[PDB]
C-alpha cells in the first residue's frame with residue numbers, strides 16, 4: 001500500500017504513516033518547503049516525474065529530509081528541477097535577490113540516497129548535516145548557470161556530520177563541487193566535477209563546529225574549474241583539519257590553482273597573511289595530475305608559522321600554469 005502524494009500538503013500531512021512513499025510530479029507552492037522530515041523510520045521515498053517549486057525570493061529550504069534508515073530514490077526519468085534561472089542574477093548568496101537553499105539532508109541517519117537527479121538550483125544544492133549516510137550516483141546539473149547568472153551553486157556543502165559517503169556524483173556548477181566546512185569520516189569518490197571551484201575542505205572556522213577529520217577524496221575528476229584540490233581556513237580562527245587524503249585526482253582546464261592550501265581567509269577572501277589556530281596535519285596527496293590554463297598556479301601553500309605539518313606529498317604531476325613564488329611555511333613533506 002504505497003502512499004502516492006501529488007502535493008506538498010499531502011506529503012507533509014501523511015508521510016509519517018507510510019512505509020513506501022511516491023512523490024508524483026509535486027509542484028511545491030512558492031515560499032514553502034517540501035517537508036519530508038517526519039518520514040517513518042525504515043521507509044522508502046521515490047521521486048517520480050518532475051518535482052518543481054513556485055517562485056518566491058526567500059531563504060528556503062525547498063526540500064527538507066529527516067529520519068532514520070531511509071531509502072531515497074528516483075524513478076526512471078524523474079528530476080527535481082529548481083528552475084534556478086528565475087533567481088540567478090550573477091550575485092548568488094552575496095547580493096541581489098534573496099535565493100532559497102535547495103535540499104537539506106539534515107537530521108538524517110543511517111540512510112541511503114540513490115540516483116538523485118537535480119537541475120538548476122537557485123544557490124547551493126545540497127546541505128548535509130547527517131550521520132552515516134550514503135549519497136550515491138547523484139547528478140547536480142547547474143550547467144545552465146554558466147550563461148544564465150548562476151553563482152554560489154555548490155554541489156555538496158557538508159558540516160556537523162559523521163560518516164558521509166558520496167559515490168559517483170556528477171556536479172556541473174559555478175562554485176565548489178564539495179565544500180567540507182566540518183565533519184568526520186567523509187568520503188567522496190568516483191566523482192565528476194565541472195565548471196566550478198573544485199573539491200574543497202573549508203572554509204574552516206568561526207562556526208559551531210570547526211573540526212574536519214578523516215576525509216578521503218579520491219578517483220575523481222575536476223574540469224574547467226578554478227581549483228582542483230583546496231583546503232581553506234579562516235584567519236585568526238580556531239579549529240583542526242587532519243587526516244585528509246587526496247588520491248588519484250585528475251584535473252583539466254584548471255584556471256586558478258591546481259592544489260591550494262591556505263590559512264588566510266577572512267570575509268570569504270584571502271588576506272595574504274596566514275594565522276596558526278587551525279592546524280592542518282596528516283595530509284596525504286597521492287597522485288594529482290592534469291592540465292592547467294596559462295594563468296593558473298600549480299601549487300599554492302600559504303601556511304602559518306608551524307601550523308601545517310606531517311604531510312605526505314607524492315605523484316603531483318601537473319602540466320601548464322605557473323610555479324608559485326609566494327608559498328609560506330611549506331611542510332617538509334611537500335612542495336610548491
Ligand SMILES: *[C@@H]1O[C@H](CO)[C@@H](O[C@@H]2O[C@H](CO)[C@@H](O)[C@H](O)[C@H]2NC(C)=O)[C@H](O)[C@H]1NC(C)=O
Pocket residue numbers: 185186187214215216
Ligand atoms: C575514516 O573513514 C573511513 C570511512 O571513510 C572509516 O573506515 C570504515 O569502517 C568500517 C568498519 O567495518 C568499514 O566497513 C568501512 O568500509 C570503512 N570505510 C572505508 C571507506 O574504508 C575509517 O575507520 C575512518 N578512520 C578512522 C576513524 O580512523
Ligand SMILES: *[C@H]1O[C@H](CO)[C@@H](O)[C@H](O)[C@@H]1O
Pocket residue numbers: 008009012013035
Ligand atoms: C508540513 O505541512 C503540513 C501542512 O502543509 C503541516 O501540517 C506539517 O506540520 C508540516 O508543516
Ligand SMILES: *[C@H]1O[C@H](CO)[C@@H](O)[C@H](O)[C@@H]1O
Pocket residue numbers: 003004009010011013014015
Ligand atoms: C496524506 O495522505 C493520506 C493517505 O495516505 C491521507 O489520509 C491524509 O489525509 C493526507 O492526504
